[PDB]
Design a protein around this nucleic acid. Sequence first.
DNA 1: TGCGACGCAAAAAC
DNA 2: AGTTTTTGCGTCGC
Length: 290
Amino acid sequence: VILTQLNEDGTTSNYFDKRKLKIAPRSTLQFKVGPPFELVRDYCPVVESHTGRTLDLRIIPRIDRGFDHIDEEWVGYKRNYFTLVSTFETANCDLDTFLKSSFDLLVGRLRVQYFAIKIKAKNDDDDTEINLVQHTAKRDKGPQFCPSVCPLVPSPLPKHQTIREASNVRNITKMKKYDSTFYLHRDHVNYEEYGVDSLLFSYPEDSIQKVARYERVQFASSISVKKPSQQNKHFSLHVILGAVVDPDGIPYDELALKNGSKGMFVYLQEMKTPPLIIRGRSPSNYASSQ
DNA sequence: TGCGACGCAAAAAC
DNA sequence: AGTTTTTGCGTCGC
């Protein structure tokens, strides 16, 4: 009834079918590693502005809640939360050096203001985009919002246990313990070490995330989860790493910038999950029906 | 059909 | 060690 896989950090992922077994909402059995991500493609090259060295980039994503591996399918539930986390790494550039340097896109050089991640959901069979929604912990007693673009600096991805432990922290002492894992506070660096043109100082806010954490995410309530044939639709979750540039023939999205003007989120790399099945609100999707 | 809404219930968080 | 918080899902009614 429960199939267990050992995670990289020694925790377990426990896959179970909610058609057959109902587990408490806050049970640790609800936390588990989801489908592995695969490269879709690389897009615009990035180079360091004097050396000309190409920056090696890699998205490092993981799903930590919401998806079970059941009979060779990855299965989520429309009504339930998923968590998708991601960092990126620069294999050829240590963070401290990276933040002091400056980088251009090779398209013809556009200066990179900052790096950022966004997530998307798609129908994996036809590439149609599907809306995602997020809640706060307060859920219906708080606002709903769409996943946002997250400025980030390169970092290793925290272990599954760390994401679990940090999921519902409010206590200040505990927040302090995790702060260095999730944030870089630019206002605490020695400004004299940095040039005006440095990458660190073109990030939009002083508090810069090291990890993009999309928690309490759902597929939009309007999604149709079956095809007309009654076959399940296949969905995929996508993580895109971009460079944000000043807009003043390559893939990009427009972005509401800090100064008000219309930025460009230029695509650098994209990864996606294998096909996902989403179970809808039908009673037959729940053990309560049996 | 199935969706927005209301809120029970059970373990985490403190 | 009691209270509050968080989140899967049972249910009503349109």
